[PDB]
Enzyme design. Sequence first.
Site, PDB file in Angstrom:
ATOM      1  CD  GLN A  24       4.447 -12.661   5.793  1.00  0.00           C
ATOM      2  OE1 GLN A  24       3.318 -13.196   5.830  1.00  0.00           O
ATOM      3  NE2 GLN A  24       5.386 -12.853   6.736  1.00  0.00           N
TER       4      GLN A  24
ATOM      5  CG  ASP B 234      -0.691  -8.915  -0.609  1.00  0.00           C
ATOM      6  OD1 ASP B 234       0.413  -9.115  -0.054  1.00  0.00           O
ATOM      7  OD2 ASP B 234      -1.763  -8.675   0.030  1.00  0.00           O
TER       8      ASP B 234
ATOM      9  CB  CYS C 260       3.500  -3.864   1.277  1.00  0.00           C
ATOM     10  SG  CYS C 260       4.197  -4.744   2.743  1.00  0.00           S
TER      11      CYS C 260
ATOM     12  NE  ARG D  57       2.690  -6.267  -1.603  1.00  0.00           N
ATOM     13  CZ  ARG D  57       1.440  -5.957  -1.952  1.00  0.00           C
ATOM     14  NH1 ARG D  57       1.137  -5.672  -3.215  1.00  0.00           N
ATOM     15  NH2 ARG D  57       0.457  -5.928  -1.055  1.00  0.00           N
ATOM     16  CB  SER D  58       7.682  -3.595   3.531  1.00  0.00           C
ATOM     17  OG  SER D  58       6.617  -2.743   3.159  1.00  0.00           O
TER      18      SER D  58
END
Length: 279
Positions: free
Chosen positions: A261, A180, A214, A220-221
């Site tokens: 992110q 993450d 995610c 992540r997506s």
Amino acid sequence: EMEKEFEQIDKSGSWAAIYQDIRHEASDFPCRVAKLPKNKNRNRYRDVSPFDHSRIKLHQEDNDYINASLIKMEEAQRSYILTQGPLPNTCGHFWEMVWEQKSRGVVMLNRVMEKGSLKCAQYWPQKEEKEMIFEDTNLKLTLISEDIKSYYTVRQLELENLTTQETREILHFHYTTWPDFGVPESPASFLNFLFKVNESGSLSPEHGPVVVHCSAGIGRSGTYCLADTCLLLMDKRKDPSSVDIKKVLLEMRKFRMGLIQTADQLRFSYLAVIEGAKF
Ligand SMILES: O=C(O)C(=O)Nc1sc2c(c1C(=O)O)CCNC2
Ligand SMILES: [Cl-]
Ligand SMILES: [Cl-]
Ligand SMILES: [Cl-]
Ligand SMILES: [Cl-]
């Protein structure tokens, strides 16, 4: 040509500045439905909501809301459903969305617990003999088999609409070594996983959009979808060198907030696109 820009950003050390520019320029559309009091328990993170214009609507009669967005990349000719990791009370909603949208693949980029915190409910069965019944949405889900590799797992699931007894095969593509707020361990392993998803037949035009998630459905997506979309565009434009990854990311962010992110996830997306464009 794309790596020349990459080398310049690296040499200048301006990934953070490019990433913050994107955050500043990104679309701001309303999320009024997501923020209704009745939906408070359907959102995993108060700062991650679907825009009203692109949210997926559930078709049963009492509440249509799920934290999921349709990303329609018209030029790349691909759509994706990006969603948060379901909560214990939204696993039935998740599978209802999969059924109603006719998806045949689910891409999971997180683990259920990360750094000792729950990030996603155990929304699929780990054991063949212990199937899951979603009584609220009238669905049953059975693990049929798993193909476990060193850094990812591909599961065959059988989703049954208990109302009609119709069954469908869902393939679950579970990337298990993507941290993450982090990046895959190599562009090659990310690309081999992406290629497995794309060659599986889950993304055929006869099926609904792939579901990608995610924990929040954005970091992540967003990295996965940006790389996949840019590689589609390079294989599709008469001039592949005209693909501007920053422009593509801003386009995607018209459909869901916060995609990618960290600045290192942006850097990784460039790297994956460069490596994949060669292969
Ligand atoms: O799972 C991802 O890749 C992802 O974007 N996660 C996100 S985005 C995001 C959070 C998280 C989280 O997992 O804690 C915490 C709340 N702020 C936004
Ligand atoms: Cl309300
Ligand atoms: Cl509902
Ligand atoms: Cl897991
Ligand atoms: Cl953001």
